[PDB]
Amino acid sequence: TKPCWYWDKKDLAHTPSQLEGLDPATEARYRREGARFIFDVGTRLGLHYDTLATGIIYFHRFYMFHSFKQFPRYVTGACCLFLAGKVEETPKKCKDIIKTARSLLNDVQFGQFGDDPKEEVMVLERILLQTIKFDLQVEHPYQFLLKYAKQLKGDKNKIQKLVQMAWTFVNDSLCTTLSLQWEPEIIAVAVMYLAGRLCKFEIQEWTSKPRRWWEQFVQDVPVDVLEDICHQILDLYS
Amino acid sequence: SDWGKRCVDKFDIIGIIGEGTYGQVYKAKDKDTGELVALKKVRLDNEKEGFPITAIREIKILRQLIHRSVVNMKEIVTDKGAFYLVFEYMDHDLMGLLESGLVHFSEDHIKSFMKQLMEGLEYCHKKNFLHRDIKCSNILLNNSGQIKLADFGLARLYNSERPYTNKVITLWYRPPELLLGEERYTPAIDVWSCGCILGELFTKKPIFQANLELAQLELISRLCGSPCPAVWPDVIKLPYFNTMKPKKQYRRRLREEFSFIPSAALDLLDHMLTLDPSKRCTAEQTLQSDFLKDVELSKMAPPDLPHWQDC
Ligand SMILES: *CCC(=O)Nc1cc(N(C(=O)NCc2ccccc2)[C@H]2CC[C@H](Nc3ccc(C#N)cn3)CC2)ccc1N1CCC(N(C)C)CC1
Ligand SMILES: [Mg+2]
């Protein structure tokens, strides 16, 4: 009864947007624009980091079954955030999300909302709920970043700096389809592996003994997996 | 898995089962297999905030709970509008059965009923979930003899290692700590309501029948003794302890007003109807009582459950 919410990179190269003729870099920017729209809107309303991430996860999954050439990105983004508030028990009125959405977008960007932006978001809630198969509960790499870093004993300033850079990497990872690739536990260790290389830190010295320090947090995670997640996060800065 | 895509036209509405929070409950049958189902209509056409957060709550709780004694949500269906929540069809509820007068439950029946109910509640409690709406109407019984727990819309997660809403259970099954204003309560509110229905299965009438909270508190205190620091040292911390007090300091007389029920059943009822929730029975140890220790369900028989009512 629990559906599978992960795709290969070959499956991610054949999204409904690509089949309808959209460019891969254009879809990747649509996901960036849309995910960072649910991000900017959510903070202005004072929403919680799981609530923003849940709306973004709904957003990336919605466009595995629908193409951007049929569903505007920002209307879907505002709809996903509106649904994420109820599921995460931090509900915001749709009227506030649109009054906020109008305050951050253009005249042509907000033009996707039509003459009645409220209803245009309301009718999409039915499409989104069926698209997410009513699998409302999701986990984000934030909780695993804190959960795994708690078991690290060592320099308090170096460990605290580690989770500070990995946290922003979890923010940046939400603009990519990494959510549709690896479980939240894989992303949490990936941002710790990445942040440990940029700080010149040796994480295993804060664990037991020396070493693949994450084999005690996540099962069977080859390094090639973690270095692939790091690439897609670092590419956001290119 | 892929839920929400199938249409309601695959079902035929037989009749109206009841009226839930989001809509009416419909008895329906599958046009493809013949399975009876219960459909909960969740309207969103007119709602101001789209899909009700109350139904979203009920959805993401029931999709974490899989158990023989918990109603399983089969699927979700639309129309082409609104959505319908598909549940496994149960044949009866215990309230409708007792109010009819056509059913008589033996202690062999009550032991089987309590073993399934306490087994399902222990599963929900082990997952850190309060039901917060246990009553006779929400206990569903099959003609095969299977017991199930239903209507999880008011169920909430519980902090195992924080405060919640005070008044949550219908008054006839609400524990004394909520009447006195407790807001950081425990699963012990659920094992209390089950105490009220354990006694109700031997009386066909709810144990504590009042309409106001104060008029309720004295009714329990007339049976279980008045809440005092001697048997419940934390009464002095609940808000309305002094504002809402019984007429006199009654003595517990549960072991005699229910002297007709079996000893093992009376010993379990006393442990489940204790005033102090810190001293109240745990759902796990309710199945370790002398009344439910050696009750193998496969060696039981379904009860006298009727099939038609002037409904
Ligand atoms: C014509 C009979 C009828 O449908 N009316 C009805 C039936 C019931 N239920 C009973 O089990 N007991 C009534 C009874 C008692 C003793 C002897 C015979 C009949 C239903 C209880 C729910 C059952 N299914 C169920 C419910 C919920 C879920 C979930 N999730 C899953 N399955 C099916 C049997 C209760 C109420 C009523 N009425 C009749 C009057 C109606 N008015 C007039 C509109 C309201 C409900
Ligand atoms: Mg009910």
d(CA A197, CA B153): 47
- Residues sharing a CB contact under 8 Å with residue A37, sequence separation 6 or more, in sequence order: A73, A74, A77, A78, A101, A104, A105
A75 and A125 in a single domain? The answer is yes
Are B286 and B118 in contact by the 8 Å Cβ rule? The answer is: yes
Q: Which of residues 64-93 of A touch B (CB under 8 A)?
A: 82-83, 86-87, 89, 91, 93
Distance between Cα B73 and ligand 2 center (Å)? 15
Our answer on whether the CB atom of B306 is closer than 6 Å to any ligand 1 atom is: yes
Radius of gyration of chain A (CA): 19
CATH 3.40.50.800 fits B8-88, yes or no: no
Are B88 and B150 in contact by the 8 Å Cβ rule? The answer is: no
What the block records as the tokens of A97 is 């999300």
A21 and A124 in a single domain? The answer is yes
A22 and A94 in a single domain? The answer is yes
- Residues sharing a CB contact under 8 Å with residue A107, sequence separation 6 or more, in sequence order: none
Distance between Cα A59 and ligand 1 center (Å)? 41
Number of residues that make up chain A: 238
d(CA B42, CA B22): 5
From the list B49, B59, B81, which residue is nearest A134 (CB)? B59
Are A11 and A63 in contact by the 8 Å Cβ rule? The answer is: no
Deposited experimental method:
X-ray
Residue with tokens 């309590």: B114
Are B141 and B113 in contact by the 8 Å Cβ rule? The answer is: yes
| Geometric angle at alpha carbon B71, from B70 and B76, rounded to 5° | 140
d(CA B130, CA B57): 13
Last residue of a domain, one of A108, A131, A154: A131
Output DSSP code: residue A219. S
The strand pair at B139-141 and B92-93 is best described as antiparallel
CATH no. of B92-299: 1.10.510.10
Are B4 and B76 in contact by the 8 Å Cβ rule? The answer is: yes
3-state secondary structure at position B246: coil
What the block records as the tokens of A66 is 């629908």
d(CA B170, CA B136): 10
Q: Cβ contacts (< 8 Å) between B76 and chain A: which residues?
A: 134
Domains contained in chain A, number? 2
Q: What φ, ψ does residue B20 adopt, rounded to 5°?
A: -85, -165
d(CA B259, CA B282): 23
Last residue of a domain, one of A113, A131, A149: A131
Other C-beta atoms closer than 10 Å to the C-beta of A19 total 10
Kindly list the distances between the CA atom of residue A210 and the CA atoms of A156, A188, A207, A229, in Å, as whole numbers in the listed order: 19, 21, 8, 24
Are A188 and A233 in contact by the 8 Å Cβ rule? The answer is: no
Last residue of a domain, one of A131, A156, A181: A131
Q: Which of residues 35-74 of B touch A (CB under 8 A)?
A: 44, 49-51, 53, 56, 59-60, 63-64
Whose Cα sits closest to atom 25 in ligand 1?
Answer: B90
The whole domain housing A181 covers: 141-237
A94 exposure class (CB count in 10 Å sphere: 0-12, 13-18, 19+): buried
A125 and A149 in a single domain? The answer is no
Output DSSP code: residue A56. H
- Residues sharing a CB contact under 8 Å with residue B86, sequence separation 6 or more, in sequence order: B37, B38, B39, B73, B74, B75, B76, B77
Output DSSP code: residue B162. -
d(CA B95, CA B136): 5
Output DSSP code: residue B70. B
Position A153 in a domain = yes
What the block records as the tokens of B138 is 């929400």
Other C-beta atoms closer than 10 Å to the C-beta of B193 total 25
Cβ separation B49–A1 shorter than 8 A:
no
Residues β-bridged to residue B27: B15, B38
Position A1 in a domain = no
Are A67 and A15 in contact by the 8 Å Cβ rule? The answer is: yes
From the list A1, A125, A137, which residue is nearest B51 (CB)? A125
Position A3 in a domain = no
Our answer on whether the CB atom of B38 is closer than 6 Å to any ligand 1 atom is: yes
d(CA A197, CA A189): 12
Position A44 in a domain = yes
Other C-beta atoms closer than 10 Å to the C-beta of A225 total 17
Distance in Å, alpha carbon of B4 to nearest chain A alpha carbon: 5
Q: Does the annotation place B23 within a ligand binding site?
A: yes
The beta strand positions in chain B, using DSSP E, are 11-19, 24-30, 36-43, 73-78, 82-88, 92-93, 129-130, 139-141, 147-149, 156-157
Position A51 in a domain = yes
Radius of gyration of chain B (CA): 20
Of B190, B207, B210, the residue nearest B134 (C-alpha)? B190
What the block records as the tokens of A157 is 């300033």
Are A228 and A181 in contact by the 8 Å Cβ rule? The answer is: no
Which of A36-67 are b and which e, b meaning 16 or more Cβ less than 10 Å from the residue's Cβ?
bbbbbbbeebebbbbbbbbbbbbbbbbbbebb
CB pairs under 8 A between A and B: 56
Resolution, angstroms, 1 dp: 2.7
Kindly list the distances between the CA atom of residue B218 and the CA atoms of A3, A11, B124, B135, B245, in Å, as whole numbers in the listed order: 51, 66, 31, 20, 8
d(CA A93, CA A91): 7
Are A80 and A34 in contact by the 8 Å Cβ rule? The answer is: no
Distance between Cα B77 and ligand 1 center (Å)? 22
A161 and A113 in a single domain? The answer is no
| Geometric angle at alpha carbon B166, from B162 and B170, rounded to 5° | 135
A29 and A51 in a single domain? The answer is yes
d(CA A166, CA A170): 6
| Geometric angle at alpha carbon B285, from B284 and B289, rounded to 5° | 135
* All structural domains of chain B with their residue ranges: 8-88, 92-299
Are B148 and B70 in contact by the 8 Å Cβ rule? The answer is: yes
Of A172, A184, A197, A202, the residue nearest A148 (C-alpha)? A184
Residue with tokens 């800065």: A237
Other C-beta atoms closer than 10 Å to the C-beta of B56 total 22
What the block records as the tokens of A229 is 């997640």
A175 and A219 in a single domain? The answer is yes
Position A4 in a domain = no
| Geometric angle at alpha carbon B221, from B215 and B227, rounded to 5° | 115
Instruction: Provide the Cα torsion B158, B164, B165, B166; round to 10°.
Output: 90
d(CA A40, CA A23): 25
| Geometric angle at alpha carbon B116, from B113 and B120, rounded to 5° | 140
d(CA B53, CA B46): 14
d(CA B158, CA B128): 5
Kindly list the distances between the CA atom of residue A156 and the CA atoms of A14, A152, A160, A163, B249, in Å, as whole numbers in the listed order: 45, 9, 6, 11, 57
CATH number at residue A75: 1.10.472.10
Q: Cβ contacts (< 8 Å) between A123 and chain B: which residues?
A: none
A161 and A100 in a single domain? The answer is no
CA A117 to chain centre: 25
Of A209, A98, A108, A194, the residue nearest A153 (C-alpha)? A209
